[PDB]
CSV table of C-alpha atoms in Angstrom, one decimal:
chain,number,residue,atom,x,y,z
A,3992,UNK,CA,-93.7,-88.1,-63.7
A,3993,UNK,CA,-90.2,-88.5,-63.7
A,3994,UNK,CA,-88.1,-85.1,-62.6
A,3995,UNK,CA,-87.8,-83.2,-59.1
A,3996,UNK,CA,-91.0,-82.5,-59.1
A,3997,UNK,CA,-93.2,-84.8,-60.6
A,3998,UNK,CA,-91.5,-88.2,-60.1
A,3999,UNK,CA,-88.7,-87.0,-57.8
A,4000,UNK,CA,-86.4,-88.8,-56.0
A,4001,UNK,CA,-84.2,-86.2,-54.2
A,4002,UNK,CA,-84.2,-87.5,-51.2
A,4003,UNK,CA,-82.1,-87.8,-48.1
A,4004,UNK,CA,-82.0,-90.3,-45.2
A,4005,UNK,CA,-81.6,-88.9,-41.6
A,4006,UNK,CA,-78.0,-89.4,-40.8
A,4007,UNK,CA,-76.6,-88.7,-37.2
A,4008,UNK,CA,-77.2,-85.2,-36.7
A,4009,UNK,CA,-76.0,-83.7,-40.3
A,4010,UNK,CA,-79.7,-83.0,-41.4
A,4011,UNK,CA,-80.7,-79.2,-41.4
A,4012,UNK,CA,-81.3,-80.0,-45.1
A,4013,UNK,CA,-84.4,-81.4,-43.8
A,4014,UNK,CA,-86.2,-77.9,-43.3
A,4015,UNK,CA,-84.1,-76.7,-46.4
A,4016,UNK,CA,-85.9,-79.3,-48.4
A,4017,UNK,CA,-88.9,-78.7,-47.1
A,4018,UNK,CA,-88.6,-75.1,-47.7
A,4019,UNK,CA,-87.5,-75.5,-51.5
A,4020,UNK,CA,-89.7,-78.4,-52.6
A,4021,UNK,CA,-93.0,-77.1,-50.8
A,4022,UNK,CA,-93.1,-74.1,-52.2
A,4023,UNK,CA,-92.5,-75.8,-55.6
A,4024,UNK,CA,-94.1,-79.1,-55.2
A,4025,UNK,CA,-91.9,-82.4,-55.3
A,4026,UNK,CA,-91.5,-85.8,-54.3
A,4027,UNK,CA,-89.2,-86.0,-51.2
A,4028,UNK,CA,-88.7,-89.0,-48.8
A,4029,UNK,CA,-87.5,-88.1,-45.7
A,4030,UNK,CA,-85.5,-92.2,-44.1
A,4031,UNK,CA,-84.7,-92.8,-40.6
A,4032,UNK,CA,-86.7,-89.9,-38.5
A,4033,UNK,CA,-87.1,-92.5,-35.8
A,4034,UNK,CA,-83.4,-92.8,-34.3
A,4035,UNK,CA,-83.6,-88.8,-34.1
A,4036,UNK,CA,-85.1,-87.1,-31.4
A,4037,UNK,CA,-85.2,-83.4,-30.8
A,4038,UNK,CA,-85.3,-82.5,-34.5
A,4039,UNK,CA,-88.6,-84.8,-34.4
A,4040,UNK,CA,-89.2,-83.4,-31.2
B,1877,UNK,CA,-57.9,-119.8,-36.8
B,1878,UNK,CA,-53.9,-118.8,-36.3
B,1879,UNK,CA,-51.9,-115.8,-34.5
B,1880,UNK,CA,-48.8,-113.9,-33.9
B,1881,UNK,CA,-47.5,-112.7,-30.4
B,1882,UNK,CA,-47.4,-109.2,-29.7
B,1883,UNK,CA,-45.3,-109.2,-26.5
B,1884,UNK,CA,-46.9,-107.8,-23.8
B,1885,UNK,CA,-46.0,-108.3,-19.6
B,1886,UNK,CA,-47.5,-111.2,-17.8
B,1887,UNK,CA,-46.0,-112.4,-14.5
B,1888,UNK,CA,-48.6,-111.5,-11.2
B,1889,UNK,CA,-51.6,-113.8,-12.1
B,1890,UNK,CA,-52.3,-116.9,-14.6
B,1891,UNK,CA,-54.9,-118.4,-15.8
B,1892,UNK,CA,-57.7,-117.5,-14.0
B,1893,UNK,CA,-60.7,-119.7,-13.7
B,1894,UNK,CA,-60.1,-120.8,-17.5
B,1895,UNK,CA,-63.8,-122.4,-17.4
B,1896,UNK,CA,-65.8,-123.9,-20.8
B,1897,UNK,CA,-68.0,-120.5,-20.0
B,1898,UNK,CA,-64.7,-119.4,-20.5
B,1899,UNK,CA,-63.2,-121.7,-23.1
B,1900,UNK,CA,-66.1,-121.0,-25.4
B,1901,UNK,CA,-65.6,-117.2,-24.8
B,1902,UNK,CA,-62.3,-117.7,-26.5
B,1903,UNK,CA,-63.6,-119.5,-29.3
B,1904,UNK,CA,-66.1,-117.0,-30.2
B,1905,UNK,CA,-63.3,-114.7,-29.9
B,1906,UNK,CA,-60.9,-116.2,-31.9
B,1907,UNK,CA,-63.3,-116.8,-34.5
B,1908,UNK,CA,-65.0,-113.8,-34.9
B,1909,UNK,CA,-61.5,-112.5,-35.0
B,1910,UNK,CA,-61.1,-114.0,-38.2
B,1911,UNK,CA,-64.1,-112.1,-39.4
B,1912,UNK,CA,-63.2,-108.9,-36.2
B,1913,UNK,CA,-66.5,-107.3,-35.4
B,1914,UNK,CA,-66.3,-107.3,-31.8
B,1915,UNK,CA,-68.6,-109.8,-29.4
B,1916,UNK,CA,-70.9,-109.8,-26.7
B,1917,UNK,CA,-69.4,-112.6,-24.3
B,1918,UNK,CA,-72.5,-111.3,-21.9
B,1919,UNK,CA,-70.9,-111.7,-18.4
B,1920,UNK,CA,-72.1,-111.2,-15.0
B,1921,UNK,CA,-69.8,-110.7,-12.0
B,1922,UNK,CA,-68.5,-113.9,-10.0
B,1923,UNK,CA,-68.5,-115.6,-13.6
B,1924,UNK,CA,-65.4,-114.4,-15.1
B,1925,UNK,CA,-66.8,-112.0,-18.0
B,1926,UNK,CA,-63.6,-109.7,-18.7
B,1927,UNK,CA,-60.5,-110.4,-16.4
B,1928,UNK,CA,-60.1,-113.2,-19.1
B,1929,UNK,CA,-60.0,-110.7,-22.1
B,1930,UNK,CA,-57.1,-108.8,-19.9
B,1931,UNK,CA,-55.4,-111.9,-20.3
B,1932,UNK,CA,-56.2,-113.4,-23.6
B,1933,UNK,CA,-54.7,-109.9,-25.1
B,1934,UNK,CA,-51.5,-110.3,-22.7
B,1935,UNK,CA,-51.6,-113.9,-24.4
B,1936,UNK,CA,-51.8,-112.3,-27.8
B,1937,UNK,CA,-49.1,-109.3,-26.5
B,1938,UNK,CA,-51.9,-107.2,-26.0
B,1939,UNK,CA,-52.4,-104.2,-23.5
B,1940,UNK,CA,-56.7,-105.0,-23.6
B,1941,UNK,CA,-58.4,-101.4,-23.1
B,1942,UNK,CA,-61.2,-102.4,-21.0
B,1943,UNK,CA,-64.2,-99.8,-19.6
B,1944,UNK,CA,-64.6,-101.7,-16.8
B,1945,UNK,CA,-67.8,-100.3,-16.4
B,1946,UNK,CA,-69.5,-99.4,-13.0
B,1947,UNK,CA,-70.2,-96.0,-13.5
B,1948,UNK,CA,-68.4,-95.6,-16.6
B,1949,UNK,CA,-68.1,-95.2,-20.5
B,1950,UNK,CA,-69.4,-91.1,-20.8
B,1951,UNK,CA,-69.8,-89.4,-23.7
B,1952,UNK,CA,-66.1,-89.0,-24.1
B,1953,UNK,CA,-65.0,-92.4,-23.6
B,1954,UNK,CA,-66.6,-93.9,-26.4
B,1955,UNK,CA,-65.6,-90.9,-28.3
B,1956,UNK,CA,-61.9,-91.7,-27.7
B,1957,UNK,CA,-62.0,-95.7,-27.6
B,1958,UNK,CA,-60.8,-95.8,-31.2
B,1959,UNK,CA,-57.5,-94.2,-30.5
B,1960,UNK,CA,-57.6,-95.8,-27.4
B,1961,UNK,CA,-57.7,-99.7,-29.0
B,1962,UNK,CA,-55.8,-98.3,-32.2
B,1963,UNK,CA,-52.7,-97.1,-30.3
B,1964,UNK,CA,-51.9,-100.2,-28.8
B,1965,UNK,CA,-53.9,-102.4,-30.8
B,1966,UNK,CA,-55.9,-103.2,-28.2
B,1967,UNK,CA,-59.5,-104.7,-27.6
B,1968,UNK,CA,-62.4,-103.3,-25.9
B,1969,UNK,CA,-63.9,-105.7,-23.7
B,1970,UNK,CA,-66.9,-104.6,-21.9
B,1971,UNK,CA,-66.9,-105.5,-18.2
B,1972,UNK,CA,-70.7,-105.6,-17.2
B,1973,UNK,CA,-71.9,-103.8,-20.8
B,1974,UNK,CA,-75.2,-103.3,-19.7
B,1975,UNK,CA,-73.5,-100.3,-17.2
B,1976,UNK,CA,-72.6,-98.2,-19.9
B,1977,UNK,CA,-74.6,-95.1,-21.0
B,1978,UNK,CA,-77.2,-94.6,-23.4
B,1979,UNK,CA,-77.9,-91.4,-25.8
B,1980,UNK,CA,-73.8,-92.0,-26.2
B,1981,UNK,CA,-74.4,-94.9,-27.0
B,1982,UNK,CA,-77.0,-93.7,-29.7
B,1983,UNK,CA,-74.8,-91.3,-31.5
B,1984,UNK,CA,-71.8,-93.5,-31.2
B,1985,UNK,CA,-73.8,-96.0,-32.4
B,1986,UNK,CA,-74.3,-94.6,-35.7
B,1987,UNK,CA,-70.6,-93.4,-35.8
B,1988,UNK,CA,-69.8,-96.9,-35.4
B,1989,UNK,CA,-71.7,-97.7,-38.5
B,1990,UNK,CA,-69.4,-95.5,-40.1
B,1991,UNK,CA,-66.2,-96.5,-39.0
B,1992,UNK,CA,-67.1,-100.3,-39.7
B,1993,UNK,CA,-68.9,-99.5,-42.7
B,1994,UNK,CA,-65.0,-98.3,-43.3
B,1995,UNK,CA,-63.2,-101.3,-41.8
B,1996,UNK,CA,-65.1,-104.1,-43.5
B,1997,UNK,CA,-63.9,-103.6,-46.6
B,1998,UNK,CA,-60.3,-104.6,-45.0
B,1999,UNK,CA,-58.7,-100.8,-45.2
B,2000,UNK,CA,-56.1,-99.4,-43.1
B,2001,UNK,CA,-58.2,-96.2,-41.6
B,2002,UNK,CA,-60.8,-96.1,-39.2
B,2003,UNK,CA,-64.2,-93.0,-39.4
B,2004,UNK,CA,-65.1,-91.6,-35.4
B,2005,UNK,CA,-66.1,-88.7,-34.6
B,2006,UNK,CA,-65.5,-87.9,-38.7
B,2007,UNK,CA,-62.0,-88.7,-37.7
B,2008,UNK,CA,-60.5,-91.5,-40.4
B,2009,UNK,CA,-56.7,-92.8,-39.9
B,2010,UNK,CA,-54.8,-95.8,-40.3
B,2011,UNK,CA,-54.3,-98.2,-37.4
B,2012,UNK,CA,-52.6,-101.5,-35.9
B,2013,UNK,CA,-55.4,-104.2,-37.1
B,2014,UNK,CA,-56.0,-105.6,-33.8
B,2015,UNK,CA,-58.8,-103.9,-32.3
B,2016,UNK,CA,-62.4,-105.5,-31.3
B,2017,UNK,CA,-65.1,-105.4,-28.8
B,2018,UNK,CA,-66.3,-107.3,-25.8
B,2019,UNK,CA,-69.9,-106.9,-24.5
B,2020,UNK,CA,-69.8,-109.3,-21.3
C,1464,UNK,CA,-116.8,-34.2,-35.8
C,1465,UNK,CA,-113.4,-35.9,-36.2
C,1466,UNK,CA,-112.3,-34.5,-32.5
C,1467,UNK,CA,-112.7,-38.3,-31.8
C,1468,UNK,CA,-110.1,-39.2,-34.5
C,1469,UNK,CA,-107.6,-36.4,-33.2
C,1470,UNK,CA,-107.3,-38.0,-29.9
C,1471,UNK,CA,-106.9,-41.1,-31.6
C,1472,UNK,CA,-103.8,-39.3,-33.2
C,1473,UNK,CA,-102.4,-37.9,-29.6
C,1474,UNK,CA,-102.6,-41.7,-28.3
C,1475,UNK,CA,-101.9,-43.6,-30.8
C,1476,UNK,CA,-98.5,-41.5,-30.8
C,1477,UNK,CA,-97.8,-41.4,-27.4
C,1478,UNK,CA,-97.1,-45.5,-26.7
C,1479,UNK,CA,-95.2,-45.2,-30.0
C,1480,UNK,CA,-92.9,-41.8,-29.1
C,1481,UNK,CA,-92.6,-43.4,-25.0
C,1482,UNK,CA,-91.9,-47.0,-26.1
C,1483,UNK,CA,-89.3,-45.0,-29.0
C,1484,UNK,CA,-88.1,-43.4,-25.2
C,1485,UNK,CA,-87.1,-46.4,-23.5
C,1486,UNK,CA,-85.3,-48.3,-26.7
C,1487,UNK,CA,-83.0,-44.7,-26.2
C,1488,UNK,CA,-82.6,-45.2,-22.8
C,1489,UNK,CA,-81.5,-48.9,-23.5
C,1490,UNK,CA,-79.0,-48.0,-26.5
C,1491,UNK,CA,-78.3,-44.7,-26.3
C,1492,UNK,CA,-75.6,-45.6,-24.0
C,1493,UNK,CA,-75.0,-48.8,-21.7
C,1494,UNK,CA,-72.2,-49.3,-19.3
C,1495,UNK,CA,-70.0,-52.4,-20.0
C,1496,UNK,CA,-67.7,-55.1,-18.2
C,1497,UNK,CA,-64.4,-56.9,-18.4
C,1498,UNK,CA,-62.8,-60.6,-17.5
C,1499,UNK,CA,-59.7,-60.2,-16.4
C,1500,UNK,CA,-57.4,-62.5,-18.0
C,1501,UNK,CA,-53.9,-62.8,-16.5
C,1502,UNK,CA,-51.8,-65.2,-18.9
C,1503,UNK,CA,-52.3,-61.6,-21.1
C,1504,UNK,CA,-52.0,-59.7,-17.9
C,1505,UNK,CA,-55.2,-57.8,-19.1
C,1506,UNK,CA,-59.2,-58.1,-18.8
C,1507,UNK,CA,-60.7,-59.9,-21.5
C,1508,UNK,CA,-64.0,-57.7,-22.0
C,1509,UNK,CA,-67.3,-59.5,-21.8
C,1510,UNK,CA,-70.5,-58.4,-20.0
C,1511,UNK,CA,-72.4,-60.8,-22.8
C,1512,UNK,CA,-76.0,-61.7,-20.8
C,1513,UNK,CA,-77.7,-58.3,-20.0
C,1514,UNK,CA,-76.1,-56.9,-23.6
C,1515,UNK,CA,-77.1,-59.9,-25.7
C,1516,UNK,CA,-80.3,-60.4,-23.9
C,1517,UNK,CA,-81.6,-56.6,-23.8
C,1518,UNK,CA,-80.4,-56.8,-27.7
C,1519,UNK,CA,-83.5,-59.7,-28.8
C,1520,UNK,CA,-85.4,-57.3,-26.4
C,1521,UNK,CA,-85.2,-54.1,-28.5
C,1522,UNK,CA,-84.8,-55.7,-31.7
C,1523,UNK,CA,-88.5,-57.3,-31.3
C,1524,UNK,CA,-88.5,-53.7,-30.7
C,1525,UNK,CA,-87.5,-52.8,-33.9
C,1526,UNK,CA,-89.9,-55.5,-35.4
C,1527,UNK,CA,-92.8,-53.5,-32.8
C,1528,UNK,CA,-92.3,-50.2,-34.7
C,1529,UNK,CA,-91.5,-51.4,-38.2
C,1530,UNK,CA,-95.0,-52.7,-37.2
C,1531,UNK,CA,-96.6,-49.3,-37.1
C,1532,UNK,CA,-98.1,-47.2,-39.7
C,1533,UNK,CA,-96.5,-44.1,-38.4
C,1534,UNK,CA,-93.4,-45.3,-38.8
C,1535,UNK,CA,-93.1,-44.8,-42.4
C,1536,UNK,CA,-96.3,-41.9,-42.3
C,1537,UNK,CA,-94.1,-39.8,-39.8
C,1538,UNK,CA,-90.6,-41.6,-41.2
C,1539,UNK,CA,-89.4,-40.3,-37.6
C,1540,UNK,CA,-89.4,-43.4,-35.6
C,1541,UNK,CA,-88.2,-45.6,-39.3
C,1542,UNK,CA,-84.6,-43.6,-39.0
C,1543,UNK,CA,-84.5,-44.6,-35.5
C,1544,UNK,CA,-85.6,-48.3,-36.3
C,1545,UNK,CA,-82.7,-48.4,-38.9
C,1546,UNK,CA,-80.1,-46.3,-36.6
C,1547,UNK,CA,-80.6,-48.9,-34.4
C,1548,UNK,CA,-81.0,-52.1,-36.5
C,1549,UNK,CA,-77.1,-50.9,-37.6
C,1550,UNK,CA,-76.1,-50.2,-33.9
C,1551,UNK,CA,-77.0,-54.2,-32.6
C,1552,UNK,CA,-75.7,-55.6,-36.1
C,1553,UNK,CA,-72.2,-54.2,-35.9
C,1554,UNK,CA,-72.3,-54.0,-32.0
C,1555,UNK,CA,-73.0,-57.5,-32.1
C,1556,UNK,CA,-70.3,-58.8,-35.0
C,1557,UNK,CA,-67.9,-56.9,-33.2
C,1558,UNK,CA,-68.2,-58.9,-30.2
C,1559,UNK,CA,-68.4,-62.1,-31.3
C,1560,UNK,CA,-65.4,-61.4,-33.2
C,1561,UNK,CA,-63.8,-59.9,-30.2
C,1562,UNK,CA,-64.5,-63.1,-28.1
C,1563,UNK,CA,-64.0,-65.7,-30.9
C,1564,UNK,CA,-60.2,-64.1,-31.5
C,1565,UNK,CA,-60.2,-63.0,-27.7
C,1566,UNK,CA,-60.6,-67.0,-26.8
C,1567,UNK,CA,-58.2,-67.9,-29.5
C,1568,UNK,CA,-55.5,-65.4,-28.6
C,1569,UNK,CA,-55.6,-66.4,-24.9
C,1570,UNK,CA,-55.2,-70.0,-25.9
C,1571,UNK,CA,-52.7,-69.1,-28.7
C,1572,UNK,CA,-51.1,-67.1,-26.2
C,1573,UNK,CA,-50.8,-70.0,-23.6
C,1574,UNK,CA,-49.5,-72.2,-26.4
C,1575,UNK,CA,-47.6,-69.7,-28.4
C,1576,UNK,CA,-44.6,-69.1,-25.3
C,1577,UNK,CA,-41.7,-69.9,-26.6
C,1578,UNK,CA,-41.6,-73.6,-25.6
C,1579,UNK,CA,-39.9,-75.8,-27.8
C,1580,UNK,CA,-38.4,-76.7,-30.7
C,1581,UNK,CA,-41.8,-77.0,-32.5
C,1582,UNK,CA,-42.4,-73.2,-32.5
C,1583,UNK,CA,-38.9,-73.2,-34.0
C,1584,UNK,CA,-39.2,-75.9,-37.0
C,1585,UNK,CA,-43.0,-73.2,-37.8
C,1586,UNK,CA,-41.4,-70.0,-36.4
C,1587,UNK,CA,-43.8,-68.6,-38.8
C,1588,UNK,CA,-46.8,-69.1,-36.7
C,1589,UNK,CA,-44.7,-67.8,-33.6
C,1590,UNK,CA,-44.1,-64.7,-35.8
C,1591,UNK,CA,-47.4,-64.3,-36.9
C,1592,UNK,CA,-49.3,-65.0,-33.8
C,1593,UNK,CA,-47.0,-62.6,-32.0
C,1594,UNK,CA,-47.9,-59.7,-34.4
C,1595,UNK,CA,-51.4,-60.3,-33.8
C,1596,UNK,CA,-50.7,-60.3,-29.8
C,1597,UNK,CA,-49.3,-56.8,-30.7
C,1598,UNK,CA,-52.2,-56.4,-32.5
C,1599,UNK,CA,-55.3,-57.4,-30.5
C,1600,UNK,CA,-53.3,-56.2,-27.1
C,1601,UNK,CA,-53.3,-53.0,-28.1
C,1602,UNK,CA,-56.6,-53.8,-28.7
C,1603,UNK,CA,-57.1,-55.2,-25.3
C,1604,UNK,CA,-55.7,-52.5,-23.7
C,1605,UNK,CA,-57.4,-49.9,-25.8
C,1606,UNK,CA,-60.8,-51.9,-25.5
C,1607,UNK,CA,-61.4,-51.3,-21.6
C,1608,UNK,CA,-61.0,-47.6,-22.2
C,1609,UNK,CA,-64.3,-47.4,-23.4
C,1610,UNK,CA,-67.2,-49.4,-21.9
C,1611,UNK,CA,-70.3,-48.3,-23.4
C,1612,UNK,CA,-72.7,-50.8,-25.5
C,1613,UNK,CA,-72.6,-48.7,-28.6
C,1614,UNK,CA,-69.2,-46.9,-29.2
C,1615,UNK,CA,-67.4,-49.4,-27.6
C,1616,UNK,CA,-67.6,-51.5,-30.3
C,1617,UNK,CA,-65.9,-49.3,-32.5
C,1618,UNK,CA,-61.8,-48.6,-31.2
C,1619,UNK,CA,-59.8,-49.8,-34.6
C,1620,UNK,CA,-62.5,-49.8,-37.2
C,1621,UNK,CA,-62.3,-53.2,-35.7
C,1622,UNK,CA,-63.7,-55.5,-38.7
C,1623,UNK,CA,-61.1,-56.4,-40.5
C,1624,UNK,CA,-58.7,-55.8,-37.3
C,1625,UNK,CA,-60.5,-59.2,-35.9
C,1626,UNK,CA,-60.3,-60.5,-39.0
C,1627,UNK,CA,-57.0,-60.8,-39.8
C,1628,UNK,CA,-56.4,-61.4,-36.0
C,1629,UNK,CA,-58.8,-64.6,-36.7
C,1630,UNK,CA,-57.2,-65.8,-40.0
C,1631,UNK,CA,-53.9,-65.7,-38.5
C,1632,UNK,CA,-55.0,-67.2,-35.6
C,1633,UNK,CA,-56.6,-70.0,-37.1
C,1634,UNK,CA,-53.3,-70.6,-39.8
C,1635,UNK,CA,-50.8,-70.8,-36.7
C,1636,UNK,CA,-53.3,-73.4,-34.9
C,1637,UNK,CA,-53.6,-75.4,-38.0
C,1638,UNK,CA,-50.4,-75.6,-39.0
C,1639,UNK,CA,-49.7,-76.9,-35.6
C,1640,UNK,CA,-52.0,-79.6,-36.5
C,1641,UNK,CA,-50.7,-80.5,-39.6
C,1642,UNK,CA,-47.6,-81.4,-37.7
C,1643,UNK,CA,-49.0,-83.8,-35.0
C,1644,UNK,CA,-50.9,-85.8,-37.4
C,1645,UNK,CA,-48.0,-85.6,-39.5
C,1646,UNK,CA,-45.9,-87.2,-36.2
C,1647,UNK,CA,-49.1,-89.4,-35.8
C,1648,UNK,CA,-49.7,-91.2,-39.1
C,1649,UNK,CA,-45.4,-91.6,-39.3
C,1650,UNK,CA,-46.1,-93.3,-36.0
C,1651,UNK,CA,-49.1,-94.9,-35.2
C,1652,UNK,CA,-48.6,-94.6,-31.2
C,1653,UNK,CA,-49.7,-91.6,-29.9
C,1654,UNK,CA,-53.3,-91.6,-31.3
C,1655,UNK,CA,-54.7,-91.9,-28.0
C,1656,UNK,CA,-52.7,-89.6,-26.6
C,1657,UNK,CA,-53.6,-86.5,-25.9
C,1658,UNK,CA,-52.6,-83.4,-27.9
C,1659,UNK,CA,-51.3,-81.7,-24.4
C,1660,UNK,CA,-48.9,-84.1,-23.7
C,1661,UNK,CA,-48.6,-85.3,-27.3
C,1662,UNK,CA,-46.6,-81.7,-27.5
C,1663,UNK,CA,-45.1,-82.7,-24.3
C,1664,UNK,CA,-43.4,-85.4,-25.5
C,1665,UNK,CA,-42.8,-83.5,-28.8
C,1666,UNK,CA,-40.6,-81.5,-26.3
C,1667,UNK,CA,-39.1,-84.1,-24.6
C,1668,UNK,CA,-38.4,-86.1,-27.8
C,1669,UNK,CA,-34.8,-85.1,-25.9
C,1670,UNK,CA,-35.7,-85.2,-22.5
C,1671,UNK,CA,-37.0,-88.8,-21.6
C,1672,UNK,CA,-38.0,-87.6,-17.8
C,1673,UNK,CA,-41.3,-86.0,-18.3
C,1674,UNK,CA,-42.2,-88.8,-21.0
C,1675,UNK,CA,-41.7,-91.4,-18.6
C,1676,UNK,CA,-45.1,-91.3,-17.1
C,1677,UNK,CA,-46.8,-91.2,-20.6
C,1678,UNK,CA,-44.4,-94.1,-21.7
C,1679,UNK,CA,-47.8,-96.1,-20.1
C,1680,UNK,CA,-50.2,-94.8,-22.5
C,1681,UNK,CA,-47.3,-95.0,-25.4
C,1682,UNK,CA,-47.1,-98.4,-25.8
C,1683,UNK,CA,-48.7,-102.1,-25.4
C-alpha cells in the first residue's frame, strides 16, 4: 500500500516532552488501521513508564 | 588558529601552573574553537582542570562563566547558561563535570541538540528552553 | 409470588435515594475559605483541596447513578445527576478563572504601581490593568461575602467578568514583554539578567546607584 493506511508513513519521533500526539495517534490510526512508527521511546521515561 | 582581545581585568594571579596537561588543553581549545562545540578537557582536582579556562577567557577579554561544580548545576542553571555565556560571551567550563546533575542533564540535553542543531549552520540566534536570539559568538563548553 | 421482586424494589431504591442523600449533603451547600492577600489589602479566596477533592468524589458519583437503571426509569435521581454535573462544571470554571486572574492581578498588581517611566511610555496597560483592579476588587471584595461551594461562584455572572479581567491581564504583561526583548535584542547585554532587575535598571537607566551592583552581571 501506499496511503495512511496501507503504506503509511505518518509518523513522529519522540522529541523532548512535546509528544501527547503519541496517544492521539494511537487513538486515530487504531481505530482506523495504519502504519505508524513511533522513534526515540528510549530517552523518555514516564510516558513509557 | 587566530583571535581578537576582548578586554577583560587581570592583575591578582598569572599563569598558573601552565603545564603540557595544560598546554594541550589550550590547543584543543583553540581548535575546536575554530569549529566551537565545546570540550571535555576532563580534569580532576590538584591538576588544574578549570582555573585555567578563568584565565584563558581573561586572555581572550573574557569573563569565563564557570559551574564550578560541587553541588552545583540544578535544573535552573543549565536552563539559564545560555544567557549566561551569551551576555558576556563567555565560556562554560566545567570544573569537575562529573558533579553535575542528571535528569537536567537529560532534558537539556536534547535542548542542546536544538540550539546547536541552530548554531552550526553559523546563525546569529541560539534555541533553549524554545528560547532563540541572537548572541556575541563566543560561547563554548568545558567538561574537565 | 413477586413479593420477592417488591423488596427487591424497596432496596434496590434505598442505597440509591441515601447515597442521592449524602451527594446533597455535600453540594447542597459547603462553607468556603479565603487567603488573605495584603499587597490588594483583601483575602484572595481559595479553600481548593477539600472543594476540588470532594468534587472527583461526587462526580464518580454522578457516573455511580448515571449507572443505575432507575435513574432514567424514575428520571428523579437523572435531574439531580445533571443539576449537579452543571453545579461542579461552572463551580469549577469559575474558580480556576478566579485564581488564574486572582494570581495575575496580584502579580500585575505588584508590578502595575506606578513605578517608572515604563508604565508611562505603555500607560495603556497601567490604564487597563487598573480598570480591571476596579474590576476584580470589587470582585474581591464582593467575593468573601458569600462563602458557600455552590452560589458562591456566581457574584457577577462571573464568566466573561474573568474573562476580560484575563485578556487584559495577559495584553498588559505581554506588552511588557515585547518591550524588554525589544531593549534586549537592541542590546545584547542583559540576556542573563534577570527580568526583576532588568526593569530595575530600566528604571535606573537615570539613576546609576541601584545599577551599580548589577553593572557585574552587565558586562565582561
Amino acid at each position: 500500500g501506499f496511503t495512511l493506511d496501507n503504506g503509511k508513513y505518518a509518523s513522529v519521533s519522540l522529541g523532548q516532552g512535546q509528544e501527547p500526539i503519541a496517544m492521539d495517534r494511537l487513538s486515530a490510526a487504531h481505530k482506523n488501521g495504519g502504519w505508524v512508527l513511533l522513534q526515540n521511546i528510549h530517552l523518555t521515561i514516564d510516558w513509557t513508564t | 588558529a587566530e583571535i581578537a582581545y576582548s578586554y577583560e581585568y587581570i592583575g591578582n594571579c598569572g599563569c598558573l601552573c601552565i603545564t603540557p596537561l595544560t598546554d594541550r588543553c589550550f590547543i584543543t581549545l583553540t581548535q575546536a574553537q575554530r569549529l566551537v562545540l565545546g570540550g571535555a578537557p576532563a580534569g580532576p582536582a590538584g591538576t588544574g582542570k578549570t582555573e585555567t579556562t578563568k584565565d584563558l577567557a581573561r586572555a581572550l577579554g573574557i569573563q569565563c562563566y564557570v559551574f564550578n561544580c560541587s553541588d552545583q548545576m540544578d535544573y535552573k542553571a543549565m536552563g539559564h547558561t545560555y544567557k549566561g555565556l551569551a551576555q558576556t560571551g563567555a565560556w562554560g567550563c566545567f570544573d569537575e563535570f562529573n558533579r553535575i546533575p542528571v535528569a537536567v542533564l537529560s532534558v537539556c540535553s536534547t535542548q542542546y541538540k536544538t540550539v546547536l542543531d541552530a548554531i552550526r549552520a553559523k546563525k546569529e540566534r541560539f534555541t533553549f528552553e524554545d528560547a532563540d536570539i541572537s548572541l556575541k559568538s563566543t560561547v563554548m563548553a568545558f567538561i574537565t | 409470588d413477586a413479593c420477592s421482586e417488591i423488596v427487591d424494589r424497596a432496596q434496590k431504591e434505598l442505597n440509591i435515594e441515601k447515597q442521592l442523600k449524602k451527594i446533597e449533603d455535600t453540594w447542597a451547600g459547603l462553607s468556603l475559605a479565603f487567603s488573605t492577600y495584603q499587597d490588594s489589602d483583601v483575602m484572595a479566596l481559595l479553600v481548593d483541596d477539600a472543594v476540588n477533592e470532594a468534587l472527583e468524589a461526587d462526580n464518580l458519583q454522578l457516573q455511580n447513578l448515571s449507572g443505575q437503571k432507575y435513574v432514567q426509569s424514575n428520571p428523579m435521581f437523572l435531574e439531580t445527576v445533571s443539576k449537579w454535573q452543571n453545579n461542579m462544571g461552572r463551580v469549577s470554571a469559575v474558580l480556576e478563572t478566579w485564581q488564574n486572574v486572582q494570581k495575575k492581578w496580584q502579580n500585575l498588581e505588584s508590578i502595575f504601581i506606578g513605578s517608572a517611566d515604563i508604565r508611562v511610555q505603555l500607560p495603556e496597560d497601567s490604564k487597563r490593568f487598573d480598570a480591571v483592579n476596579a474590576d476584580f476588587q470589587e470582585l474581591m471584595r464582593t467575593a468573601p461575602d458569600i462563602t458557600n461551594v455552590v452560589e458562591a461562584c456566581t457574584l457577577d455572572g462571573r464568566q466573561e467578568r474573568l474573562e476580560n479581567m484575563q485578556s487584559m491581564l495577559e495584553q498588559c504583561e505581554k506588552a511588557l514583554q515585547e518591550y524588554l526583548e525589544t531593549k534586549r535584542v537592541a542590546f545584547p547585554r542583559f540576556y542573563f539578567v534577570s527580568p526583576a532587575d532588568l526593569l530595575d535598571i530600566l528604571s535606573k537607566g537615570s539613576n546609576p546607584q541601584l545599577i551599580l551592583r548589577h553593572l557585574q552581571k552587565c558586562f565582561d
